[PDB]
Write a protein that binds this ligand. Structure first.
Ligand SMILES: OC[C@H]1O[C@@H](O[C@H]2[C@H](O)[C@@H](O)[C@H](O[C@H]3[C@H](O)[C@@H](O)[C@H](O)O[C@@H]3CO)O[C@@H]2CO)[C@H](O)[C@@H](O)[C@@H]1O
Ligand code: CL
Ligand code: CU
Length: 235
């Protein structure tokens, strides 16, 4: 159970984005139905009044929280991966539009899941803004909690992989468009009951064997991190 509070751009806090530049759902409950329209941008997908200006090459940091800013972030039980996707905003997230910019699942070096490191990072994970066409975009940050993912939601709707999905409205101003955005995958649709990484038993199956759901990270993607960029306590 987690939500996005706002974003930072090059370590500068853009301020509380909830219902402002984040298409915030009404609460932190997960999405679990893989064929739900709610898989696009969570249960209240609509245009919000602001879009955060960035340029290609900026560091864009998403900041998550549980109940209040810079708290426990997400229950520690919620082990799983983190991904970020991008789509042109005019699509409203519909159709074959989502391109993956970031994946972090289980780090064998550190023996930690992305969610574990997100807690340590005070809810902060970042991407480099890619060199796509200037314009308005949706950045879809997705945490998958796997603690009940041994079951398919379609078999037992009390369980299943849990999707904490947050769409941020980002406007890319200065970009050379050296890597034009291609078509991508649909949400709902990209993840199905047979997709690797959706049904996974963290109690019985080693995390060293976990394969995150496709698609693969796009060749145009410039990278990211799971790390505290900004100190909310200084404000
Ligand atoms: O026993 C089932 C699993 O529970 C997990 O805890 C979640 C609770 O099930 C859920 O009821 C609770 O929801 C809270 C939410 O955290 C809070 O922010 C909101 O204000 O109210 C909700 C209740 O209406 O969330 C927790 C997760 O934080 C355990 O984490 C898990 O190990 C356990 O299997
Ligand atoms: Cl939960
Ligand atoms: Cu939860």
């Amino acid at each position: 159970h987690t939500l996005v509070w706002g974003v930072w751009v090059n370590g500068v806090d853009q301020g509380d984005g909830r219902n402002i530049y984040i298409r915030s759902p009404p609460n932190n409950n997960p999405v679990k139905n893989l064929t739900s329209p709610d898989m696009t941008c969570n249960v209240d997908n609509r245009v919000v009044p602001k879009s955060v200006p960035v340029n290609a090459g900026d560091t864009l940091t998403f900041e998550w929280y549980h109940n209040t800013r810079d708290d426990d972030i997400i229950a520690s039980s919620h082990h799983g991966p983190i991904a970020v996707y991008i789509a042109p905003a005019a699509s409203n997230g519909q159709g074959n539009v989502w391109v993956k910019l970031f994946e972090d699942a289980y780090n064998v070096t550190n023996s930690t899941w992305a969610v574990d490191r997100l807690i340590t990072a005070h809810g902060q994970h970042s991407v480099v803004v890619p060199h796509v066409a200037p314009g308005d975009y949706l950045f879809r940050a997705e945490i998958i909690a796997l603690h009940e993912a041994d079951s398919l939601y379609s078999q037992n709707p009390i369980r299943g992989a849990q999707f904490y999905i947050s769409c941020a409205q980002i406007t890319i101003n200065s970009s050379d468009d050296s890597t034009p955005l291609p078509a991508g995958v649909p949400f709902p649709g990209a993840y199905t009951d047979s997709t690797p990484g959706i049904q996974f038993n963290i109690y019985t199956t080693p995390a060293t064997s976990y394969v995150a759901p496709p698609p693969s990270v796009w060749s145009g993607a410039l990278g990211g991190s799971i790390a505290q960029v900004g100190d909310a306590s200084l404000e």
